[PDB]
Amino acid sequence: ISQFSEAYNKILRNSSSASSCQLVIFVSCLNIDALCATKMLSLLFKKQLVQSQIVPIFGYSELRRHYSQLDDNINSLLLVGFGGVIDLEAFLEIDPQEQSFRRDIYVLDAHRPWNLDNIFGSQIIQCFDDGTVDDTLGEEKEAYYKLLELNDLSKRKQRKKQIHEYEGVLEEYYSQGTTVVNSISAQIYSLLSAIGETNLSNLWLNILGTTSLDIAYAQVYNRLYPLLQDEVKRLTPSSRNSVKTPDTLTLNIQPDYYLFLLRHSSLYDSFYYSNYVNAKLSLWNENGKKRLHKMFARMGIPLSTAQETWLYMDHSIKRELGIIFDKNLDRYGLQDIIRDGFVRTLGYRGSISASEFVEALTALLEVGNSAQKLTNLRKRWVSNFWLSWDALDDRKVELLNRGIQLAQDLQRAIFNTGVAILEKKLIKHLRIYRLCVLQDGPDLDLYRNPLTLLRLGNTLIECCAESEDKQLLPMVLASIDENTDTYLVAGLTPRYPRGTKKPILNNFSMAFQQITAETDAKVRIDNFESSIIEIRREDLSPFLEKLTLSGLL
Amino acid sequence: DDDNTEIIKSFKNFILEFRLDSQFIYRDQLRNNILVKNYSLTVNMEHLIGYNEDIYKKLSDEPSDIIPLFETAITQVAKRISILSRNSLPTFQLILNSNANQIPLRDLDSEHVSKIVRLSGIIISTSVLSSRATYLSIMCRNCRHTTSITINNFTVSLPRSCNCGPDPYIIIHESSKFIDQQFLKLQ
């Protein structure tokens, strides 16, 4: 509810001291956006050389272990991606200490709607709600100034009728789907441009941030291109090349493709594993696989030349890469492939597509790495976080490729198993919504991570619906290996075929909390996201039955 | 042959200006190779194709007409590094190993002939060494023409012109520079 620059000067005044400082910025959690945000944030701190702690939090339940344990001198705290949904004032408590409260916890979140207790009643925040939903948002505005603090019998009856009158519309709010408005990174950059830093790798961090989520919607991002492209116009390494030159040597616009790993993998394998194209061409089917080859017969690209790594393909095919696709792809309905994208060239190393980089980092997060076992695993993910954090750095590229050799493999897993599902037609159309469960599969170790099931769930909800009449219906998935029937189940959102009228607001967040409040059968919201929960095989089936009814949508 | 000048200038500009941040990998590959008396260079194609797409476009086109202009191109560089003046320095062999796409043995049938092919197999037996030639002098049986023939790679008959004929040219083995050869055979 504040100016970004002024919130900045506040976090400046409470910061620098002897001993320095102290602030812990919480990077959270598994979302690439977090990295994108906190890296340019951390670089900004290093600019004024302000000491910082930075914590890799996984579990939402895990945050309590930290904040309740170690705090001493820390008067100014910062947090990322948490608290937009569940309020930490009740969750942490707080317990006001010393107006002009000593500690300011900044909470940065893209999630909506905000918790009601957060924005109004200033204690721990210093909210980041600005500027996306301001709004009004008159529904939260009347939620308090009316409620607080609230012949005489008719005035009591009138008063109470008014109270429930506000409580109904208030109940409409805060019970709702969790949907990201704008990427937190973008706003950190809006905060950053007011201070005056135009830095190139910074901007690349923004591009990374925005393009973190294009796998899932945009939704506003379709109109974020002005806010990026203009900035790309606010700077330039040289008016003209001047090949290369070995330095600056920076990012530029190119006809990029939702196509998967075009530059770091072989072309044919790049269609065959791509996510958008899995769908339209029915590639899980042997009968459709051929249709790809017909694409190549249309392009005049040899099959043998399609099998070869993209660095080494002939030059003629490169110069025709932006034409041939226009000549052909239009006929297959694949006409939405070509985006205007961002590509940063490091020169003699190669170039990297904005999206593919994100595929590298995601790749890093799950691989390349009774409560003791889950804690130890979540711990392994915590360590792995930094292995992924390092790849963002420019000076070490040598491990970034270790991401990509993984990002390929994962797909080779994911695709494979994905097909293993469609052969058995495991989809349960049900009535109100679509649902699935993986009872068996190869290498569930890869599927342990929330984000792995976010991407498999994504290629699957993308595959089932082209569309593909009728009625985009949200999907459900489940997997188990070890940790005694943890059976991780993540919520999902429907995918429109590039024509998106409504955000549609994932409802699993609410539907799960209704069940936690009913019989709560081995239901665990331990994962940071409201869409993803844990379950046991003993209680999963009654849970599934209680999921089927009553349907909130 | 101004074109060969144009190609070799690009190869020199590829060796002297190449930067992996910030050491020059090749240029030092060179020095550290002449000192141990290795007289070789190993190019990494990915860096090559990174540098110019063009020279790799031609190098995968007609390799055997180009690669030796790359050899002479690099040895003309070691002249400016390993020594200085104002010998003898053999033209270095380049060894280029790169990822690309593995092409299995069964799948080699014509069509890629004279195009660089990465592959994989278990070597059966190695043939005993024998020398080919690199630089050999030649005198005529009659007019006694003294000809220094620079034989290159990659067979090549001797020139018949300074009766005389048909092929009056003798190999002088007292001045002739020789290299070695192996013949692997791989299953």
PDB file of C-alpha atoms in Angstrom, chain B residues 27-41 74-75 77-79 81-83 89-90 92:
ATOM      1  CA  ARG B  27      46.391 -19.239 -28.607  1.00  0.00           C
ATOM      2  CA  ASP B  28      47.631 -20.738 -25.342  1.00  0.00           C
ATOM      3  CA  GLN B  29      46.822 -24.223 -26.564  1.00  0.00           C
ATOM      4  CA  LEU B  30      49.392 -23.422 -29.228  1.00  0.00           C
ATOM      5  CA  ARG B  31      52.208 -22.159 -27.004  1.00  0.00           C
ATOM      6  CA  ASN B  32      51.784 -24.848 -24.383  1.00  0.00           C
ATOM      7  CA  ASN B  33      51.909 -27.285 -27.284  1.00  0.00           C
ATOM      8  CA  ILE B  34      55.074 -26.091 -29.017  1.00  0.00           C
ATOM      9  CA  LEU B  35      57.003 -25.976 -25.753  1.00  0.00           C
ATOM     10  CA  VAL B  36      56.514 -29.670 -24.936  1.00  0.00           C
ATOM     11  CA  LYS B  37      57.313 -30.180 -28.657  1.00  0.00           C
ATOM     12  CA  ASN B  38      53.842 -31.582 -29.425  1.00  0.00           C
ATOM     13  CA  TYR B  39      53.440 -29.557 -32.634  1.00  0.00           C
ATOM     14  CA  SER B  40      49.668 -30.010 -32.660  1.00  0.00           C
ATOM     15  CA  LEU B  41      46.441 -28.122 -31.974  1.00  0.00           C
ATOM     16  CA  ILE B  74      47.877 -22.172 -37.885  1.00  0.00           C
ATOM     17  CA  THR B  75      51.552 -22.908 -38.512  1.00  0.00           C
ATOM     18  CA  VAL B  77      50.654 -18.366 -36.469  1.00  0.00           C
ATOM     19  CA  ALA B  78      53.179 -20.475 -34.516  1.00  0.00           C
ATOM     20  CA  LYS B  79      55.830 -18.642 -36.547  1.00  0.00           C
ATOM     21  CA  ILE B  81      54.612 -17.007 -31.339  1.00  0.00           C
ATOM     22  CA  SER B  82      57.183 -19.746 -30.774  1.00  0.00           C
ATOM     23  CA  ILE B  83      59.995 -17.786 -32.402  1.00  0.00           C
ATOM     24  CA  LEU B  89      58.850 -25.535 -37.906  1.00  0.00           C
ATOM     25  CA  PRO B  90      56.664 -28.375 -39.295  1.00  0.00           C
ATOM     26  CA  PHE B  92      51.075 -28.565 -37.113  1.00  0.00           C
TER      27      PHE B  92
END
